[PDB]
Design a protein around this nucleic acid. Structure first.
Length: 106
RNA sequence: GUAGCGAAAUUCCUUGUCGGGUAAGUUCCGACCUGCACGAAAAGCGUAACGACCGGAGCGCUGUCUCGGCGAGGGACCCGG
């Protein structure tokens, strides 16, 4: 029966996982795990909430300023491209919570 | 770098998260504090009244727009110059 869990950037997530018996691990993985996407996205980080059932992960479930200095500089584009790129590393980390549970449970 | 204020006639990231105001808002208000790059005399913070200033919000009244319709007269037209 084991105890198939799940993963979601954070940890422990809502409150799933039971007992994956008879390959039942991935059996429902591509099902429940792929919970659409919590209906709500919250931010543009795109956290990857996998399924820490008991591995070894299993399941596998941003402003637009860049184009404004138009017509040139595959240079300066990059300059302003890194600015926000740094936030992600400082966001997902500092941006505690990021847990939008209590959606539909499906 | 004290106080004090803070995502503001400064916050890149980045519509930043919580909150409210509204059907739903990157607008604004409130706090939030990671102050990229605020800061004590190139003060700031507060702040009455005053303002042909910027910002929201609501009520009113209501052809901007929802869709116009007709009229009025001065040209625009034909002839005369």
């Amino acid at each position: 029966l084991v105890k198939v869990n799940v993963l979601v950037h954070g940890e422990v997530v809502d409150a799933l996982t039971f007992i994956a018996h008879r390959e039942k691990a991935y059996t429902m993985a591509r099902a429940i795990v792929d919970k659409l996407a919590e209906v709500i996205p919250r931010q543009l980080f795109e956290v990857p909430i996998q399924a820490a059932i008991g591995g070894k992960i299993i399941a596998r479930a941003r402003k637009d300023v860049l184009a404004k200095c138009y017509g040139g500089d595959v240079t300066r584009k990059k300059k302003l491209l890194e600015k926000q790129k740094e936030g992600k590393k400082r966001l997902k980390a500092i941006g505690k919570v990021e847990v939008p549970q209590e959606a539909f449970l499906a």
